[PDB]
């Protein structure tokens, strides 16, 4: 079928949430990028630069108004008339984050906010900050823009969470059409707004160590792996996510097993997570 | 003819935010400016925590080099803690952090540069683009190309499960610490990192490093423009040994002709035309300060201007490759010839002009990977299945460290500073910092700003020669700003 056109904007990411992707094992990202959307705005990976590629954009923002999806990666910083972001210049006018947000958010369909700063903050918003970095969903709704957002955290989100959540509501809206199946996928949104397949179970109650947990039997170094990592500062307590099963780039380790859980896909990551090396 | 002023907002196939600005004359590049648009502070947003959550946080500066930063910050951490990591722990890490310089040489290469000599599929994002791309090869090698774009999507994929393998996860891995590394080899994860290692060397040594030369020789005007300063730095990386002494990289300054020692104490970032408070400017990073300015007049970056000693240097595959002069790989040495003409053995074999040009950085960076493959095979030889490779220290009270390594793209150091158990400064020297920073306070220029002139652009209808000598040094604004 058509693939959908999708913009990706970053504010203040890392760039990990495009990387993350990157590793997508089934489907591949070359399968995601050649059959499943069509990428029609990415900094990163894009043909073309500059101002003809912000222009190519607004061409396809006005022929499909109201029919792209909007991937946000990274904060948006409000504090300094959005100047701690700067994302193009066009018509030679600079383009804040800001800017680009209230310009594209009315007219999608649906935008996902990709990582955790881009869904409650993260680590831009964190003590010691000073560029006032903003929340998708806060930023747009405080500015009246109603367009639904899909939270997909995570420091990065796992690629299965990304290209799972596009396959949900690209499932969706196949069988109700566009606002039907964004009403579907919103009815499986946490109070987080996050996708309940994925973000739905507690790591610890799932923990492969919760036995050495309940009886108490903790490691005292990183590298002793019978015991559970409680003390070392895993923070799987109080993370809502499947990496327990699902693990990390291709099966071969996650988290938990290799050192702690940082809690990276909750609201209050990072600082409600810190210090990470202790309980 | 006469002037035409281009500016190119946001550059792509970049990582990260940056604005160029190059001015035209009789169809050269005669002035640049880069401009760093995007902030988030770090060195603020550390202060007052557990010195021990730096070695994660940092990592948040860029998911394309978080291991970069982990390792920076972990060294860091060691001095200031006084961890002695043991000696299977630092194997450990070398594994963890130089499957990510594979990753990041080959991501590099083929999604972020191959489209500036190849043409991709008939579907977005490999269109549209500038009518004259300059788009050389021809249509068998252009396919070749793209083919090889799609296989090295999973080669990459590959090398993040081989650090993950000792590394948690990528990005941002969770194995390394202070006082060394989280997870002990085991023989079958040894086994398991070596069969992903095979299918990576076998991609480099027979498809990646041949097609930087094949293309290379179908640009051969590649090697002609993008000299700059001819100026490098190397701070040293990857310890063969617990001595402190033998690295895979030795450090080194080169400038004017002339090889020097690297003295830490010699950098110093100004801050005149970056958005910073002026009162900030000329500190050596033991004594940073960062300050945000954005409604500075006369600034244009969020990006500070390192110099050493007052040099403005570049960093990443070309400057340790021209700073160590190892041999060249066979390939190279055979391709030089049968395609160039060129008679080569070591590195500097290539000249300084050719190495320190547009092309030459891609050869680096192809060539530095295949050094890298050997890196790996002898720690793969040397790590002990097994053996422990941390140890717990207690966090000082008060306390200093400088951690340097080398990022994919270039130098990098970070210094801690702790008091009262918390972090009382942390200050970042990044590798794109060196790159692609602005002038310093007495107006001399960036090395890719000065880089940048004499670039042709006999079109300025399709400027493309600005981006893709950007791109030949791997920027990554997000690294560059922090
Ligand atoms: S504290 Fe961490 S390691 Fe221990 S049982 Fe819970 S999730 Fe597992
Ligand atoms: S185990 Fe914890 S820190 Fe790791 S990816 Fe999952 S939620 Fe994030
Ligand atoms: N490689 C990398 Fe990142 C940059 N520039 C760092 O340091
Ligand atoms: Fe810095
Ligand atoms: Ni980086
Ligand atoms: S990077
Ligand atoms: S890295």
Redesign the pocket.
Same mark, same amino acid.
């Given at each position: 079928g058509e693939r959908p056109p999708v913009f990706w904007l970053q504010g203040q990411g890392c760039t990990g949430c495009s990387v993350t992707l990157l590793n997508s094992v089934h489907p591949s990202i070359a399968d995601v990028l050649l059959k499943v959307i069509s990428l029609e705005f990415h900094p990163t990976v894009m043909a073309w630069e500059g101002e003809h590629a912000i222009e190519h954009m607004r061409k396809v923002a006005e022929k499909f108004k109201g029919k792209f999806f909007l991937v946000i990666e990274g904060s948006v910083p409000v504090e300094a008339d959005g100047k701690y972001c700067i994302i193009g210049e066009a018509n030679h006018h600079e383009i804040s984050m800001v800017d680009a947000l209230k310009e594209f958010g009315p007219n999608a369909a649906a935008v996902l906010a990709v990582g955790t700063c881009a869904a409650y903050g993260g680590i831009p918003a964190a003590e010691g900050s000073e560029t006032g970095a903003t929340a998708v969903s806060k930023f747009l709704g405080d500015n009246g823009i109603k367009t639904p957002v899909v939270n997909i955290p /995570? %420091?990065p989100p796992?690629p299965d969470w990304i290209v799972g959540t596009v396959v949900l509501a690209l499932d969706a809206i196949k069988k109700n059409g566009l606002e039907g199946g964004l009403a579907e996928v919103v009815k499986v949104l946490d109070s987080d707004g996050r996708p309940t397949p994925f973000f739905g179970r507690n790591?610890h109650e799932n923990c492969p160590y919760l036995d050495k947990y309940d009886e108490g039997v903790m490691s005292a170094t990183f590298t002793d792996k019978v015991g559970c990592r409680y003390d070392l500062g895993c923070?799987?307590p109080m993370?809502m996510?499947d990496?327990?099963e699902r693990k990390?780039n291709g099966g071969v380790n996650?988290?938990?097993q290799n050192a702690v859980?940082? /809690? %990276?896909?909750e609201p209050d990551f990072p600082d409600g997570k810190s210090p990470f090396y202790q309980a | 003819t006469g002037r035409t002023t281009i500016a190119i907002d946001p550059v792509t196939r970049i990582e990260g935010h940056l604005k160029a600005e190059v001015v035209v004359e009789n169809g050269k590049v005669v002035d640049a400016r880069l401009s760093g648009g995007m902030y988030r502070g770090f060195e603020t947003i550390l202060r007052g925590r557990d010195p021990r959550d730096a070695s994660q946080i940092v990592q948040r500066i860029c998911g394309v080099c978080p291991t970069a930063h982990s390792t920076a910050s972990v060294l860091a951490l060691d001095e200031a803690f006084g961890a002695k990591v043991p000696n299977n722990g630092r194997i450990t890490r070398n594994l963890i952090f130089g499957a990510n310089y594979l990753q990041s040489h080959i991501l590099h290469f083929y999604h972020l540069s191959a489209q500036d000599f190849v043409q991709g599929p008939d579907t977005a994002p490999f269109v549209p683009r500038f009518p004259k791309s300059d788009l050389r090869l021809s249509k068998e090698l252009n396919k070749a190309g793209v083919d090889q774009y799609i296989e090295a999507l999973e080669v990459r994929r590959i090398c993040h499960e081989m650090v993950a393998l000792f590394g948690?996860?990528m990005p941002h891995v969770?194995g390394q610490v202070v006082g060394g590394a989280t997870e002990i080899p085991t023989k079958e994860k040894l086994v398991e990192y070596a069969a992903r290692f095979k299918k990576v060397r076998d991609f480099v040594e027979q498809k990646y490093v041949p097609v930087v030369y094949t293309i290379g020789s179908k640009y051969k005007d590649m090697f002609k423009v993008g000299q700059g300063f001819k100026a490098a730095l190397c701070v040293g990386a990857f310890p063969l040994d617990n001595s402190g002494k033998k690295h895979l990289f030795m450090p080194g300054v080169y400038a004017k002709g002339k090889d020097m020692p690297f003295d830490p104490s010699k950098i110093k970032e100004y801050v005149k035309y970056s958005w910073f408070a002026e009162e900030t400017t000329g500190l050596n990073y033991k004594e940073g300060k960062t300050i945000p300015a954005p409604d500075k007049a006369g600034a244009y970056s969020f990006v500070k201007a390192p110099r050493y000693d007052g040099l403005s240097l570049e960093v990443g595959p070309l400057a340790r490759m021209w700073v160590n002069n190892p041999e060249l790989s066979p390939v190279g040495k055979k391709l030089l010839k049968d395609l160039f003409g060129i008679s080569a053995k070591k590195f500097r074999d290539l000249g300084e002009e050719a190495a320190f040009s547009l092309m030459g950085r891609h050869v680096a960076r192809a060539e530095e990977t295949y050094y890298m493959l050997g890196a790996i095979e002898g720690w793969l030889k040397e790590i002990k299945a097994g053996e422990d490779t941390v140890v717990m220290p207690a966090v000082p009270a008060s306390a200093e460290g400088t951690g340097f390594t080398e990022a994919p793209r270039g130098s990098l150091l970070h210094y801690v500073k702790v008091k009262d158990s918390k972090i009382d400064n942390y200050q970042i020297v990044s590798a794109s910092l060196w790159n692609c920073n602005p002038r310093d306070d007495m107006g001399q220029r960036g090395a890719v700003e000065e880089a940048l002139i004499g670039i042709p652009v006999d079109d300025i209808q399709n400027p493309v020669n600005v981006a893709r000598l950007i791109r030949a040094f791997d920027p990554x604004l997000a690294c560059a700003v922090h």
């Open positions: /995570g %420091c796992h790591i923070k799987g993370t996510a990496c327990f990390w996650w988290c938990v859980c940082i /809690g %990276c896909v | 948690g996860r969770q």
